[PDB]
Amino acid sequence: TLRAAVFDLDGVLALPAVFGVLGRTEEALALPRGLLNDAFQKGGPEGATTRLMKGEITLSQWIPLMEENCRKCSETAKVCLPKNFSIKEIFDKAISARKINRPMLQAALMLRKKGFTTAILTNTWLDDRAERDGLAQLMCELKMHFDFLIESCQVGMVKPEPQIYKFLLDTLKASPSEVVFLDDIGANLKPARDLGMVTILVQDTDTALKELEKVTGIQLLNTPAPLPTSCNPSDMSHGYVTVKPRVRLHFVELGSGPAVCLCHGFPESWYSWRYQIPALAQAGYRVLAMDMKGYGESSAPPEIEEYCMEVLCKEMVTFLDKLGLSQAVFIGHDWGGMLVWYMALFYPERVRAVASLNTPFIPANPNMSPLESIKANPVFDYQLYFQEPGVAEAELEQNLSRTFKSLFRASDESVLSMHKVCEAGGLFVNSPEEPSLSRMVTEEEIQFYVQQFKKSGFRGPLNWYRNMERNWKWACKSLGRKILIPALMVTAEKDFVLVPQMSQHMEDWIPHLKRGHIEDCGHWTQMDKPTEVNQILIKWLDSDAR
Amino acid sequence: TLRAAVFDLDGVLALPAVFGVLGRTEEALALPRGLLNDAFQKGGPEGATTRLMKGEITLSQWIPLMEENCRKCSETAKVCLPKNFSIKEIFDKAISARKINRPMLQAALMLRKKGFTTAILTNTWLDDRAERDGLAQLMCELKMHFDFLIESCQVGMVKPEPQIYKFLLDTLKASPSEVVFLDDIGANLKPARDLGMVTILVQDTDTALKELEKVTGIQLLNTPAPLPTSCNPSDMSHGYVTVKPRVRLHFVELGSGPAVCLCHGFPESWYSWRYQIPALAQAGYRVLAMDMKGYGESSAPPEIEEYCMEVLCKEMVTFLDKLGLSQAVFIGHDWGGMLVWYMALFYPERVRAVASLNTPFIPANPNMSPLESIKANPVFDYQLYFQEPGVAEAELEQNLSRTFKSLFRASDESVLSMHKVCEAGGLFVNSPEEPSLSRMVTEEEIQFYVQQFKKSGFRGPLNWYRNMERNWKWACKSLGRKILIPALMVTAEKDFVLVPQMSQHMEDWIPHLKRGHIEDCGHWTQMDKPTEVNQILIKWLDSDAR
Ligand SMILES: OCCCc1ccc(OCc2ccccc2)cc1
Ligand SMILES: OCCCc1ccc(OCc2ccccc2)cc1
Ligand SMILES: [Mg+2]
Numbered sequence A, B: 001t002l003r004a005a006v007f008d009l010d011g012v013l014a015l016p017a018v019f020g021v022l023g024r025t026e027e028a029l030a031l032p033r034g035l036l037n038d039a040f041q042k043g044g045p046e047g048a049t050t051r052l053m054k055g056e057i058t059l060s061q062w063i064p065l066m067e068e069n070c071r072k073c074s075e076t077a078k079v080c081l082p083k084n085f086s087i088k089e090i091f092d093k094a095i096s097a098r099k100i101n102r103p104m105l106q107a108a109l110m111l112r113k114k115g116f117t118t119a120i121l122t123n124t125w126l127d128d129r130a131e132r133d134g135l136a137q138l139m140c141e142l143k144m145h146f147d148f149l150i151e152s153c154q155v156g157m158v159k160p161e162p163q164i165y166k167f168l169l170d171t172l173k174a175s176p177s178e179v180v181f182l183d184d185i186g187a188n189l190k191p192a193r194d195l196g197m198v199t200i201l202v203q204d205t206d207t208a209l210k211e212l213e214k215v216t217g218i219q220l221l222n223t224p225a226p227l228p229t230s231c232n233p234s235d236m237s238h239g240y241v242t243v244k245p246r247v248r249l250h251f252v253e254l255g256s257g258p259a260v261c262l263c264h265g266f267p268e269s270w271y272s273w274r275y276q277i278p279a280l281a282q283a284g285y286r287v288l289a290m291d292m293k294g295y296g297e298s299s300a301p302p303e304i305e306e307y308c309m310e311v312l313c314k315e316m317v318t319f320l321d322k323l324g325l326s327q328a329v330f331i332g333h334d335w336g337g338m339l340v341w342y343m344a345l346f347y348p349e350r351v352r353a354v355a356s357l358n359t360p361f362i363p364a365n366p367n368m369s370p371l372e373s374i375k376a377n378p379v380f381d382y383q384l385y386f387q388e389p390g391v392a393e394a395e396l397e398q399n400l401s402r403t404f405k406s407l408f409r410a411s412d413e414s415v416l417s418m419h420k421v422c423e424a425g426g427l428f429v430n431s432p433e434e435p436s437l438s439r440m441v442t443e444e445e446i447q448f449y450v451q452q453f454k455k456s457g458f459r460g461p462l463n464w465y466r467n468m469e470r471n472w473k474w475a476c477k478s479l480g481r482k483i484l485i486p487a488l489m490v491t492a493e494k495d496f497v498l499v500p501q502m503s504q505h506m507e508d509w510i511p512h513l514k515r516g517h518i519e520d521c522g523h524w525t526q527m528d529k530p531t532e533v534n535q536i537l538i539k540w541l542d543s544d545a546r
C-alpha cells in the first residue's frame, strides 16, 4: 500500500529545530514566554515570515523585519529586550547548531532501499547570510539521499497551505493513501491527513520511527550498522588529463578542500574506492579517484616499460601539473600503495602526505636481484606467474565475471591461495566455474568491473609486475633517503600476501610513520572494512594533512 | 645558428639566489666572511651538499649535516655561532624569499615563441620540509613555460660535472654551438664553453639580456607588455558531469583553492576564458571553465525550453551537487552574465560571490511584456532576429570561419552593427566574405571555435534567446529580493550593446555592489583586455571571495 515517505527538515531530518531556538532564547534570556515565537509568526499569512518562506524576500532582508516584530511584541507586552539582543546572532547560532538526525536519515535510507520514493518537504528560506555555506553543506549532504527535495522558497508555497500537498502528490506520482508524511508540527500534518495520507507527529525520533515501522512494516529501529554511502558511476564528475601523447588518465572527482589522490591496486579501478569517495568529500577533502594507467578509462599502451614505477610516477606528477595542483595527498592500496611510497621518495615536494593500505614500504635490496628476492617468499609466487607475457592475460580474460568473483572475497570465503600458483598452472585451477558472490560485492558491482576490463583486459595491469629489475635499479637511487613527510601505514590482519609483519621495519625508513590496523580484514581492504578504513583515513587526514 | 636557450633557476630565473642568503646571513650576523659558504661547500664532490644535489639525501636529512659543517668551520676559524642560529630558519626564509625574475622568464618566453627550444637546468634538491609547497608552487609556475626541466637531484648528476652537459645536449637534440646557456656561476659555465656553447655569465638581468639579445638577434629588452598565458586545450583537465539523463556538462579545470565557475556568453566556449584560466589558478583559485549547455562538448538538446534560465540555473546547481561543491564563485559574461545574477537571486546559498562582465542586472518589468521591452531598444534588434527558429541558425552555420571572424572584433575593427538587423535581413548582410583577422584572435583560435560549433551548431546557443516570456515570469518571483552577497559589475567602455549606462541603477538591487570598468574595450571583454580583466577579477576575488 504505502509507496512513498516524506520527511520534513527542521525537527525531523535535522535537530535541534531552529523554530526551537526561539523558545530556548526566551528561557535563557528571561523574556515573556512565547514573545519570540509571536514575533516570528506576526501577521500570519501576510507577515514577514511567510514572505520569507515563500521566497519573496531573502533571509537578510527578513532579519530586520523580525527585529521590528520583536520590538512591537515586547512593547505590547510592556517588557524590554536585552542590550545587544541580536536576531542575526540568535539565527546564526541556531542554524549552525542543527545537525542531521542520523537515525531519521538512516530510516529514510532504508525505506528508499526497499523501494520507497522518498522526499524532503520543507518550509525554508533563501539564505544570503555571510555564513550561508553551513546550511548549503547540510542540504547537500541530505538531498543526495532522497528522490525529491521540495522547498517552500523555491515553489512559492508553504505548509500548511493545501496547494503544496497537491504539488507534493503530483511530484511523487502517488495517491495520498500511498504516502506517509512526518512532521514535528501538527498543523502541518493536518492537510496531509485531510487527503488521507498516513501522518506521523514526530516528537522524539524513536517513537516516530516505531510508528513508521508499524505502519510501513519494515524494520527501521535496531537495524544493523549500514555500509557507508557508495558512488553511482554515472553521477560522478569524470575527469581526463593527457599526460603525454599516447597516455591519458581518467579519474572521478568529488568534494572541495585539500586534494587527495586515490591510487587503486591490481586488478582494480577508481570504483574500488567507492566507499571512501563520499566520506572523504564529506570530511572536507577534494577526492581524486584514479583509474591508474592500464585500467578502465585511462590509457593502456602495450609496452612493458610504460609501466615501470619511474614512468608511472613522472606521469602522476604531470597529472598534478596539468590540473595546476602543487601537491596532493597520495593514498594507495596494493600496487597503488607501492607507487605512493615511491612518490614520497622521489617527489616529496608534490606529496602533502602519503598513506598505504596493506602495501608496506620495503627498500630495494642492493645485494640481490629482485626476482630472487621475490622467489624467497612462497606467497609472492603469483608474481612469478605474472612474468611471462600472455599466460596470465589468457587465464584472467577468459571469464571476467569468474575472475572478479574469485578474486574479490572476504578472508573467510576465499577460493584461491597465492601459494604455488606456477606449479598448479594458474590462479584459478582449483576454483569453481561459477563462484558464489562474496558478501563484499553485489552482482551489479562485479559487472562494473567486468565492463571496465572489457576495454583493455589485463596486459597493462599485468605489466605493472613486469619491471622488477627496472624498478630495482631506480629504487636503489633512493637508498640513502628517508621519508620524513607525514605518512600512514594501514595493515590488514588477514591479508595473507601483504601480511602486517611485512611492514614491521618501516620505522627505520619513516621514523615518524603513523599506523592503523584493521582486524578481520582480508586483501580487499576498502570494500572489506569500508567503515574502519574511512574512520582511520579521516582521523589521519584531519590531524596530519590539513 | 642558435636554436636552444638554457637557463638556470637560482639567480637566473629566480631571485634573490638562495646561495646568496649564505653571504647576507654572515653580514647580518657579523660572522667571518665566507664561513657559511665554506660550510655549504665542505668536502666538495663528497660533501653533504653534493649528495643533496645528486638526490642521494633529502633536504631535511641535509639540514643537520650542514649544521655540523657550520660548527666545524667556526671551530677552525676560532669564532662562535649566535644563540639560536638555525640553518632550517635561514633556508626556510631564503627559499620563500626567492621569486621568479619576471624579465628573465619573459625573455625565455619570447625565445620560445620565435622557435627556440628552452630548458631549465638546475642544481636542486629533494625538498621534504614542512614548507616544501612554496617551492613546488614556484617550480610549477616556471616549468610550464619550458620544453625541459632538468634537475640535478632527479638525474643524479650536478653542474659542473661534464656528463650533465652531455645529458643536456642529448635532451635538447642539439649540437653545442646551437645553444646559449646562462648561469650566475662562472665555474658552471666553463664546461658549456669547453663544448663550444655560447654562455652568459648572469650578474644583473638587464646586462645578461643585452648579451642574450646580441647573440640571438631577437629583441628581449624593452619589448611591449606581453599577453597573459593562454591555455592549450589538449593540456587541460577536461571534466564531465551528467546533470540529468539527456544532459551532460563539460568544463575545463585548473588550480586549487576556492571554486570559481566561469560562464561564457553567446556564441562562445570555455575557451573564451583562456586568458583568465591560468591567471586565476595562479592566483590561488580552483577554476571551472564551462561549456554552457548548448555548446562545445556539453549537451545540446533541441527543445527551446531546455534553455530557459530556470532550467539552466537548476542544472548549474545540480552540477555543484555532483561535484560535491556547496558553493562556487560565479563569474559570467554576456548570457553567462545574466545567468549568474539569476544564480545569486535564486540560489544565494550556492554562490560564494557573483560577478558579471558587460551584462548588467536588470529586474524584470512586471508591467511590460519582455518582447516589448526588447523592442524599446534599437540595439537589441539582433535579439528579435534570433526568435524565429531556423533563420539565425542558417546564417550563422553557413560559414563558421566567417561567423567568428565577423563577430570576434575589437572596438575599432568592427564590420557588423547590431542595428536594424531584422530589416537588413541578417547579421552579416553588409560584411565581407573573408573578414580580416582581428588583432584579438589568431587563425588557430578561430578554428578552435569553428571546430567546437561543428558539433552542435547554433540551435542550442540561439535557444538561450528564445525564452523571453518564460524568463520574465520566473524573474517576476524575484522582484522583492535584493542581492546582498558579494558582487562585482565590470563595464566595458565600448560595448555598444551592453553599454556601461545600462548598469547604472544596479545599486538599487545590489546596494554593496563593487565595480570595475575597462576603457577602450568592446563586447568580447576577456580577449579584448585580458590583462585588465585578470587584474580586476583577482583584486575582487582576493578581497571579497576569499
Ligand atoms: O599484488 C601487488 C602488491 C603490491 C606489491 C607490489 C610489488 C611488491 O614487490 C615484491 C618485491 C619484493 C622484493 C623485491 C622486488 C619485489 C610487493 C607488493
Ligand atoms: O547578447 C546577450 C546579452 C546578455 C543579455 C541577454 C538578455 C538580455 O535581455 C534583454 C531583455 C531586456 C528586457 C526584458 C527582457 C530581455 C540582455 C542581455
Ligand atoms: Mg518543522
Ligand SMILES: [Mg+2]
Pocket (backbone or CB within 6 Å): B008, B009, B010, B011, B012, B017, B019, B183, B184, B185
Ligand atoms: Mg645558480
